[PDB]
DNA sequence: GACCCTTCGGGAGGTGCATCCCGGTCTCGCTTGGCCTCC
């Protein structure tokens, strides 16, 4: 009930209830989220995946494995009778406003084309690829708390177990269907407040100065240039006030630099 | 049957010629249904 998968379900995949079906009561914890059945009210969906594994899904988890061609379009013409699945979407992002329960679907142009017009009524779909997700996050006024599924992907189990609610702009969790262990959440943490202030301060610097700053920071983060050389370049180009806004973590530096080079 | 006394100075390069060219890969880290066999 009080879990991110329920939030995304109610906001985004509660549009496919009429093609979902009646759950079959179960006694084991859902294999997809992994949470105990105490919050599923004792019921569940019994299902077999393409690897012939007996899998239980809860009401939120099962929505990712539902075929609704009449609502989500046909994903592959070679298999008409199965449609686009939220758990099989790769390169498709989604921002879930938990408090408002509204959702925006950042899908590429091909996915938008495959979606029937009935889908756009329930879900507001903006045409954007995986590269323009950060553009949408940057420009749009996000409402918190929210769940930012950067890439729905195909690893639905790792997407559900990666779902983290982003309470504020300081730490926006980019869930991209890769298991969000505490060891790789730095790659999936988007510090949009710092990125926005760094972009605001990038305006004071010339295009050449900002290209030099970005290249120096990227090379240093990959240990291609010595810190002495990078410091010399920063001092010669007067980029120290930019550096004071950088996180000390090189992976965070790379993430925010990707954000800057996208905007 | 004991020492003698051990040389100088020359003069020590010149050239030529330093290639052509190939030809730089497949992959794959996921799930699903369709189709094809087959216990
Ligand atoms: Zn579940």
Query: For residue A31, which of A20, A21, A40, A22 has the smallest C-alpha distance?
Result: A40
Cα of A56 vs centre of ligand 1, distance in Å, is 8
**Neighbouring residues of A152: CB distance < 8 A, sequence distance ≥ 6:** A86, A87, A88, A89, A90, A92, A93, A94, A159, A177
Protein CA at A108 to nucleotide C1' at B12, angstroms:
85
Is the peptide bond between A42 and the residue preceding it cis, with omega within 30 degrees of 0?
Answer: no
Measured from the Cβ of residue A148, the count of other Cβ atoms closer than 10 Å reads: 25
Residue A63 CB-density burial (10 A; 0-12 exposed, 13-18 middle, 19+ buried): buried
Phi, psi of A76 (to 5 degrees): -135, 120
Q: What technique determined this structure? A: cryo-EM
Protein CA at A116 to nucleotide C1' at B2, angstroms:
135
Dist CA A245 CA A241 (whole Å):
7
A175 is in an annotated binding site: no
Dist CA A200 CA A42 (whole Å):
51
Which nucleotide is nearest to A50 if distance is taken from CA to C1'?
B32
């Amino acid at each position: 009930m009080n879990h991110p998968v329920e939030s995304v379900y109610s906001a985004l995949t509660s549009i496919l209830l009429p093609y979902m079906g009646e759950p079959v009561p179960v006694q084991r914890n859902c294999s997809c989220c992994g949470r105990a059945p105490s919050e599923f009210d004792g019921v569940g969906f019994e299902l077999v995946n393409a690897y012939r594994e007996r899998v239980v899904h809860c009401r939120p988890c099962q929505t990712f494995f539902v075929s609704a061609p009449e609502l989500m379009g046909v994903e592959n013409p070679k298999k008409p009778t199965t449609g686009q699945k939220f758990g099989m979407w790769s390169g498709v992002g989604a921002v879930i406003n938990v408090e408002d329960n509204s959702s925006v679907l950042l899908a590429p142009q091909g996915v938008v084309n495959k979606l029937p017009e009935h889908f756009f009524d329930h879900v507001e779909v903006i045409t954007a690829t995986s590269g323009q997700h950060l553009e949408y996050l940057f420009n749009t006024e996000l409402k918190f708390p929210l769940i930012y599924i950067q890439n729905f992907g195909v690893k639905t189990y790792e997407l559900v177990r990666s779902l983290r609610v982003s309470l504020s702009a300081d730490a926006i969790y980019t869930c991209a269907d890769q298991l969000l262990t505490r060891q790789n959440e730095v790659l999936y943490m988007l510090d949009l407040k710092k990125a926005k202030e760094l972009h605001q301060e990038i305006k004071n610097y010339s295009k050449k100065e900002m290209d030099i700053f970005i290249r120096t920071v990227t090379l240093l983060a990959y240990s291609r240039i010595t810190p002495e050389a990078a410091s010399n370049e920063f001092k010669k180009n007067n980029l120290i006030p930019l550096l004071l806004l950088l996180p000390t973590d090189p992976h965070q530096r790379l993430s925010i630099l990707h954000l800057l080079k996208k905007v």
